[PDB]
Structure 1
Amino acid sequence: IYSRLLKDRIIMLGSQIDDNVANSIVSQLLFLQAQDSEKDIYLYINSPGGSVTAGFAIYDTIQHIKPDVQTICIGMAASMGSFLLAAGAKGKRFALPNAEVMIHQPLGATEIEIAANHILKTREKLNRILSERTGQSIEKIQKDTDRDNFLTAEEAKEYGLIDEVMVP
Structure 2
Amino acid sequence: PSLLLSKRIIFLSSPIYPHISEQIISQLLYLEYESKRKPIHLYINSTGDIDNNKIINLNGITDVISIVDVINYISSDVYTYCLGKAYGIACILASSGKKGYRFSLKNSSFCLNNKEIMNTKKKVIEIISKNTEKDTNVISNVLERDKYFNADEAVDFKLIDHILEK
What corresponds to 2:140 in structure 1?
142
Identity %: 36
Change (3 A) 1:154 1:38: same
Contact 2:12 2:46 in 1 (8 A): yes
**What are the superposed Cα offsets for residues 1-42 of structure 1, whole Å, 9 maximum, x if unpaired?**
x81110000001122223311011111001111110111000
Letter in 1 for 2:33: A
What corresponds to 1:83 in structure 2?
92
Partners of 1:37 and 1:46 in 2: CA distance: 27
> Per-residue deviation at 1:155?
0.2
Q: In the alignment, does 2:32 pair up with 1:14?
A: no
Task: Give matches, 1:102-113, under 5 Å.
Answer: 102-104=111-113
Letter in 2 for 1:131: S
Q: Which runs of no fewer than 5 residues in structure 2 stay unpaired?
A: 50-59
Letter in 1 for 2:152: E
Contact 1:18 1:54 in 2 (8 A): no
Partners of 1:76 and 1:65 in 2: CA distance: 26
Count of residues paired in the alignment: 156
- What is the TM-score when the length of structure 1 is the normalising length? 0.87
Q: Return 9-18 or 64-73, whichever deviates more.
A: 9-18
What corresponds to 1:155 in structure 2?
153
Change (3 A) 1:155 1:26: same
Change (3 A) 1:48 1:139: same
SS state at 2:149 partner: coil
Q: In the alignment, does 2:155 pair up with 1:118?
A: no
| 4+ runs deviating over 3 angstroms | none
> Per-residue deviation at 1:123?
2.7
| Greater share of strand | 2
**What are the superposed Cα offsets for residues 64-105 of structure 1, whole Å, 9 maximum, x if unpaired?**
11100001111111111000111000100011111000012x
> Per-residue deviation at 1:119?
3.4
Q: In the alignment, does 2:82 pair up with 1:73?
A: yes
Partners of 2:41 and 2:7 in 1: CA distance: 9
What corresponds to 2:65 in structure 1?
56
Partners of 1:162 and 1:117 in 2: CA distance: 29
What corresponds to 1:95 in structure 2?
104
What corresponds to 2:128 in structure 1?
130
What corresponds to 1:30 in structure 2?
29
Partners of 2:14 and 2:158 in 1: CA distance: 24
SS state at 1:7 partner: helix
